[PDB]
């Protein structure tokens, strides 16, 4: 303009958003026992 | 206790149950030295004290 203001206006472009936050349970695997070796005792099957 | 009672149960076997007769006669008899027979020095220390 006359006092050096300018007629056509400036841009204001959009921010950015707010993202979501993001989180996991990530799981594992640790696999059964192996079954021992069965001993034969001296007691009978109710007392064992 | 119970690491103790699975030593035992897998230790535990069953016997074998002996009896043994010992007569003092036949130790004292057939002992090779100083050896002596039962019923004769029984009354020599018995009636001297």
Same mark, same amino acid.
């Given at each position: 303009? /006359?006092? =050096?203001? *300018? ?7 959009? *921010? ?9 349970? /990530?799981?594992?695997?640790?696999? =059964? ?12 099957? *109710?007392? /064992? | ?49």
């Amino acid at each position: 303009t /006359i006092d =050096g203001q *300018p007629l056509s206006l400036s841009l204001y472009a959009t *921010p950015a958003d707010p993202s979501m936050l993001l989180s996991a349970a /990530i799981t594992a695997s640790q696999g =059964g026992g192996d079954l021992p070796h069965a001993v034969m005792p001296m007691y009978r099957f *109710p007392v /064992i | 206790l119970a690491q103790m009672e699975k030593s035992y149960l897998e230790k535990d076997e069953r016997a074998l149950e002996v009896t043994r007769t010992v007569s003092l006669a036949e130790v004292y008899a057939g002992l090779t030295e100083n050896s002596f027979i039962l019923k004769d020095k029984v009354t020599e220390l018995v009636n001297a004290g």
